[PDB]
Amino acid sequence: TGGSVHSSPAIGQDGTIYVGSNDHYLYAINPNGKLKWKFETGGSVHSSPAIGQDGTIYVGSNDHYLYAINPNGKLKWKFE
Amino acid sequence: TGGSVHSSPAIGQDGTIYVGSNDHYLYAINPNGKLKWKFETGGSVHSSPAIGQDGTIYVGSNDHYLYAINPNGKLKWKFE
Amino acid sequence: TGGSVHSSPAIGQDGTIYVGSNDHYLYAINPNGKLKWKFETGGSVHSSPAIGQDGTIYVGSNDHYLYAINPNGKLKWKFE
Amino acid sequence: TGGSVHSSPAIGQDGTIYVGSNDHYLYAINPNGKLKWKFETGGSVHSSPAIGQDGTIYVGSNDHYLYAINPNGKLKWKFE
Ligand SMILES: [Co+2]
Ligand SMILES: [Co+2]
Ligand SMILES: [Co+2]
Ligand SMILES: [Co+2]
Ligand SMILES: [Co+2]
Ligand SMILES: [Co+2]
Ligand SMILES: [Co+2]
Ligand SMILES: [Co+2]
Numbered sequence: 001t002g003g004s005v006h007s008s009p010a011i012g013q014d015g016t017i018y019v020g021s022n023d024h025y026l027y028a029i030n031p032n033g034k035l036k037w038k039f040e041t042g043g044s045v046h047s048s049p050a051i052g053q054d055g056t057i058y059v060g061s062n063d064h065y066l067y068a069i070n071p072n073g074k075l076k077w078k079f080e
Numbered sequence: 081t082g083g084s085v086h087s088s089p090a091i092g093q094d095g096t097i098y099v100g101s102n103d104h105y106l107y108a109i110n111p112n113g114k115l116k117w118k119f120e121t122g123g124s125v126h127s128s129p130a131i132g133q134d135g136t137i138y139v140g141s142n143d144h145y146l147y148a149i150n151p152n153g154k155l156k157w158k159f160e
Numbered sequence: 161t162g163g164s165v166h167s168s169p170a171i172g173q174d175g176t177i178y179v180g181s182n183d184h185y186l187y188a189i190n191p192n193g194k195l196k197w198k199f200e201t202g203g204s205v206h207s208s209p210a211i212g213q214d215g216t217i218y219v220g221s222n223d224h225y226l227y228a229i230n231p232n233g234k235l236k237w238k239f240e
Numbered sequence: 241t242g243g244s245v246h247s248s249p250a251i252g253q254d255g256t257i258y259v260g261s262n263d264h265y266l267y268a269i270n271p272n273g274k275l276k277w278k279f280e281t282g283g284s285v286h287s288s289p290a291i292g293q294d295g296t297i298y299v300g301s302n303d304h305y306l307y308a309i310n311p312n313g314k315l316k317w318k319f320e
Contacts, residue, residue, distance in 0.1 A: 001320055005300025008088070008248070008288035017290070017298050019306050031292065033308060033317030048088035048128070048288070050097070052111065058097050060085025066099050068113060077113030080081055088168070128168035128208070130177070132191065138177050140165025146179050148193060157193030160161055168248070208248035208288070210257070212271065218257050220245025226259050228273060237273030240241055 001027060008048035010057070012071070018057050020045025026059050028073060037073030041065065081107060088128035090137070092151070098137050100125025106139050108153060117153030121145065161187060168208035170217070172231070178217050180205025186219050188233060197233030201225065241267060248288035250297070252311070258297050260285025266299050268313060277313030281305065 002023030009019040015031040022044040028036040042063030049059040055071040068076040082103030089099040095111040102124040108116040122143030129139040135151040148156040162183030169179040175191040182204040188196040202223030209219040215231040228236040242263030249259040255271040262284040268276040282303030289299040295311040308316040 001304050001306070003304055004283070004286075004302040005304065005306050006286050006302070007300060009290040009298045009300065009306065011290050011292055011298070015292060017292075017306065017308075019287070019298075019300055021300075021304070023304075027306065027319070029306060029319055031296070031308075033319055035319070043084070046084075046086050047099070050089040050091050052091055052095060052097075056111070058089045058091070058099075060087060060089065060099055060101075062084040062086070064081050064083055064085065064101070064103075066081070066085050066089065066097065066107065066109060068097075068111075079107070079109055079113055079115070123164070126164075126166050127179070130169040130171050132171055132175060132177075136191070138169045138171070138179075140167060140169065140179055140181075142164040142166070144161050144163055144165065144181070144183075146161070146165050146169065146177065146187065146189060148177075148191075159187070159189055159193055159195070203244070206244075206246050207259070210249040210251050212251055212255060212257075216271070218249045218251070218259075220247060220249065220259055220261075222244040222246070224241050224243055224245065224261070224263075226241070226245050226249065226257065226267065226269060228257075228271075239267070239269055239273055239275070 001025065006046045010049040010051050012051055012055065018049045020047060020049065020059055026069060039069050039073055041067060081105065086126045090129040090131050092131055092135065098129045100127060100129065100139055106149060119149050119153055121147060161185065166206045170209040170211050172211055172215065178209045180207060180209065180219055186229060199229050199233055201227060241265065246286045250289040250291050252291055252295065258289045260287060260289065260299055266309060279309050279313055281307060
C-alpha cells in the first residue's frame with residue numbers, strides 16, 4: 001500500500017480480504033493477491049474492518065468518520 | 081464523530097454497528113447510518129467493542145475502565 | 161484497572177470477559193462486573209486476547225512475550 | 241519474541257496461535273508453546289492476523305504490505 005498496514009484484515013464469505021492502510025485507503029484484495037478495489041478516506045485507516053450480514057464493510061478512519069462501504073467499493077454512508 | 085475512529089466496529093445480531101471514538105464515546109449506529117445512541121466514557125475509546133451472548137456491549141477506555149453497556153445505551157457496569 | 165484499557169475484550173463461552181490493560185495485567189471479569197482473576201505480565205497488555213478451543217486465553221504483552229493463560233488465571237506458558 | 245507483541249493472536253482450526261511482533265515477524269506457535277515457524281516482514285507487525293477458509297494467514301506490516309502466508313510459513317503473496 002502507500003503506508004503502514006496497522007489495520008487488521010477481515011475476510012469476506014467469498015475470500016476477499018479487506019484491510020485499512022495509513023495511506024488513508026480501505027483495500028479489498030482478492031485471494032490471489034490482486035486488487036479488487038480501494039476506497040479513499042480522509043485519514044489513516046487504523047480501524048480494522050467488520051463485515052455485515054449483507055456484506056457491507058464498516059471501518060473507522062482517523063478523519064473522524066465511521067465508513068460503510070458496499071461490497072463493490074462504493075460508499076454507502078459515513079458517520080462523523 | 082468528534083475524533084479519530086481508531087476502534088474497530090462490532091456488529092450486533094440486528095445489524096447495529098458499535099464503535100468507539102477518540103472523542104470519548106462509544107457509538108451505536110443503525111445499518112442505515114443513523115445514530116441509535118452514544119455513551120460517554122472519560123477518555124479515548126481505542127478499544128474495540130465485544131458483544132456478549134445477551135447483547136451486552138463491552139469496551140475499554142483510556143480512562144482505565146472496562147465498560148459494559150446495555151443494548152439501549154445505558155450503563156450496566158464499569159470496572160477500573 | 162490501573163491504566164488505559166487499549167486491549168479489546170474477548171468473551172468466553174460462559175460469558176467471562178477477558179481484556180488487557182496498560183497496567184500490565186490481563187483481566188478476567190465476570191458478567192456481573194466482579195473480578196474473576198488478573199494476571200500480571202511485564203508490560204502493557206495492548207494485545208487483545210484470543211480464546212482457544214479448550215478455553216486457553218492467549219494475549220501478547222509489550223514485554224515481548226505471547227502469554228497462554230489457563231481459564232483459572234494461572235500461567236500455562238509464555239513465548240519470547 | 242524480539243519485541244512488543246502489540247498484534248492480537250488468531251487461532252487456527254488445529255489450535256495454532258498466530259501473532260505478530262514489533263520485531264518484524266509473524267509467529268506461528270503450537271498449543272504447547274513451541275514455535276512452529278516465523279516469517280520476517282520488513283517492519284513491525286502491529287496488524288492482527290486473519291485466517292482464510294483454506295488456512296491462509298493474512299496480516300499487515302508497518303513495511304506497507306499486506307502479507308498472505310501459507311500454513312507452512314512460506315510466503316504466498318504480498319500486496320503494497
Ligand atoms: Co512507511
Ligand atoms: Co495521513
Ligand atoms: Co482529528
Ligand atoms: Co480526550
Ligand atoms: Co491514565
Ligand atoms: Co508500564
Ligand atoms: Co521492548
Ligand atoms: Co523495527
